[PDB]
Design a protein around this ligand. Structure first.
Ligand SMILES: OC[C@H]1O[C@@H](O)[C@H](O)[C@@H](O)[C@@H]1O
Ligand SMILES: [Mg+2]
Length: 535
């Protein structure tokens, strides 16, 4: 089953906030291992672990100082090997973040590189002379605030960092640096991991000519990957990322993956035109296997919007393959971001039915299966550096990173001490223990939906054809071989009725959804999904 990834459903675990088995208030690897039975019970096909590598934690793991080891607060490399073995014993694939665009400034490569202009690693990061006036080489901005360039007195040069000052970007124009990153990835492949989530995958190359970005014209939409309050959104990102050279590197990376049959990659795209970049990066069978974008990670969420995304994607490369996600550790939890003005119990169920019915692979974020709302983290508990630069207009990402509620008890059973981010009180009522045996809880809707998805080949990788069910319903067929299903979703809080545009052979009940069909007339109460076998 070497193509499991092309349609598979992956559960994203954010290790710091999953389960603290050790007792310091931070989630760790043994905590994950303890809960792998729960993960398998979701009927997902695998997991993706956010970073657990040695890190000063200034960007909570995305600032890596040793690519081939586990940070002591998460445990050890043997703990990882044990996690991997247990996941495999349960039939789960294990993917891990690879953060190859940048290192921590505490990474030995950077410690060496920064000493002078002449050392063996001088060119492994992106160094440039100041302008004659002493200022940065160009107008590029860090996503986390200020110039993307920081001066280092040792070299009398600036280095580039798209993110924190402590996250210097690796110079992909330097072949030895690219190869060192591939070798780091091979280390994990040799341990038996099933694949990688590639952080900021389109960022790897910058323009060697260091050209200024043009401004975004007034009245034009801002990028989907950053809050509008961020100055980063005032530029069109043409020279700082998404450069042609990256396509060739993706081929080298794919060649590595191809040496390990059954392994996969999902790239994180952060681009002004993200569907286009995802299609380009995942086409040709010789680059990324799949990638996700911020198209479904932002504010719009109507049936019309979703149709628009699908229509746009269906004009792009026919050999592209998307991974769809509605939540992750970088954005407001979907139950709030999309569902704040909808019924808090019913809406996440139909939203997830949609996610699980789109043509593509799926990433499901920890806690999204519980219908968890965004947490409200008080100012004095804020941890994310991205929550301390644009406050209060943008409050960072801590609200989606609060600890998982295993129980309704003290700290939700997450830790014996006060956790690194506060347990959200509302989450206790929605805890795993509270949903486990409630057939009406979102947890069990998810289990049922994913069991249903598994039972229909059309819902793994079938073609998708939009059908006309009116403006306020989302409807499409999914087809693989002899199976054609009609899928219709009412994402609204009001009943909708439509004539069906295709002939239906039978109804397919799932997960306590309650749509009524009388011949060609389909009635969908608020927040209901309907699946039918097409004649
Ligand atoms: O690596 C820097 C950024 O990369 C991307 C990750 O998803 C973010 O969590 C992180 O802040
Ligand atoms: Mg711990």
């Amino acid at each position: 089953n070497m193509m499991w990834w092309r349609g598979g459903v992956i559960y994203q675990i954010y290790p710091r906030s999953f389960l603290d088995s050790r007792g310091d208030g931070v989630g760790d690897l043994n905590g994950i291992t303890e809960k792998l039975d729960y993960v398998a019970s979701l009927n997902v096909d695998g997991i993706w672990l956010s970073p657990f590598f040695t890190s000063p934690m200034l960007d909570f793991g995305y600032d890596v100082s040793d690519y081939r080891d586990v940070d002591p607060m998460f445990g050890t490399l043997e703990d990882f090997k044990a996690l991997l073995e247990k996941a495999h014993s349960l039939g789960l694939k294990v993917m891990i973040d690879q953060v190859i665009s940048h290192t921590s400034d505490q990474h030995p490569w950077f410690q060496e590189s920064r000493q002078n202009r002449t050392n063996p690693k001088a060119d492994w990061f992106v160094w440039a002379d100041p302008k004659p006036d002493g200022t940065p080489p160009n107008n590029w901005l860090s996503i986390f605030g200020g110039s993307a360039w920081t001066f280092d007195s040792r070299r009398q040069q600036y280095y580039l960092h798209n993110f924190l000052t402590s996250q210097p970007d690796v110079n992909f124009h330097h072949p030895e640096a690219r190869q060192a990153q591939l070798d780091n990835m091979r280390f994990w492949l040799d341990l038996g991991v099933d694949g990688f989530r590639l952080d900021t995958v389109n960022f790897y190359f910058h323009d060697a000519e260091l050209r200024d970005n043009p401004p975004v014209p007034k009245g034009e939409a801002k990028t989907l990957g950053a809050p509008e309050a961020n100055p980063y959104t005032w530029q069109r990102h043409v020279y700082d990322l998404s450069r042609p050279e990256n396509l060739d590197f993706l081929k080298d990376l794919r060649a590595l993956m191809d040496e390990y049959p059954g392994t996969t990659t999902v790239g994180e795209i952060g681009d002004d035109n993200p569907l286009e970049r995802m299609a380009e990066y995942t086409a040709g069978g010789d680059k990324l296997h799949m990638a996700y974008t911020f198209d479904l990670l932002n504010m719009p969420h109507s049936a019309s919007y979703l149709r628009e995304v699908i229509e746009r994607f269906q004009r792009l490369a026919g050999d592209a393959w998307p991974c769809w996600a509605t939540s992750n550790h970088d954005v407001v939890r979907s139950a709030t971001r999309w569902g704040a003005d909808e019924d808090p119990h019913a809406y996440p169920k139909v939203m997830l039915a949609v996610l699980f019915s789109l043509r593509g692979s799926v990433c499901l974020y920890q806690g999204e299966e519980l219908g968890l709302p965004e947490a409200d983290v008080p100012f004095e508990r804020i941890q994310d550096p991205y929550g301390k630069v644009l406050w209060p207009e943008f409050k960072g990402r801590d609200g989606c990173r609060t600890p998982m509620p295993w129980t309704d008890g003290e700290q939700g059973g997450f830790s014996p001490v006060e956790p690194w981010l506060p347990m959200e009180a509302r989450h206790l009522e929605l805890a795993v223990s509270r949903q486990q045996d409630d057939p009406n809880a979102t947890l069990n809707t998810v289990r049922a939906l994913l069991a249903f998805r598994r039972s229909h080949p059309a819902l793994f990788d079938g073609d998708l054809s939009l059908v006309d069910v009116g403006d306020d319903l989302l409807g499409f067929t999914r087809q693989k071989g002899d199976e054609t299903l009609l899928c219709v979703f009412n994402l609204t809080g009001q009943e909708q009725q439509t004539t069906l545009p295709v002939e239906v052979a039978s109804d397919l009940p799932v997960a306590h959804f309650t749509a009524t069909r009388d011949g060609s007339t389909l009635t969908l109460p608020a927040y209901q999904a309907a699946f039918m076998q097409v004649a």
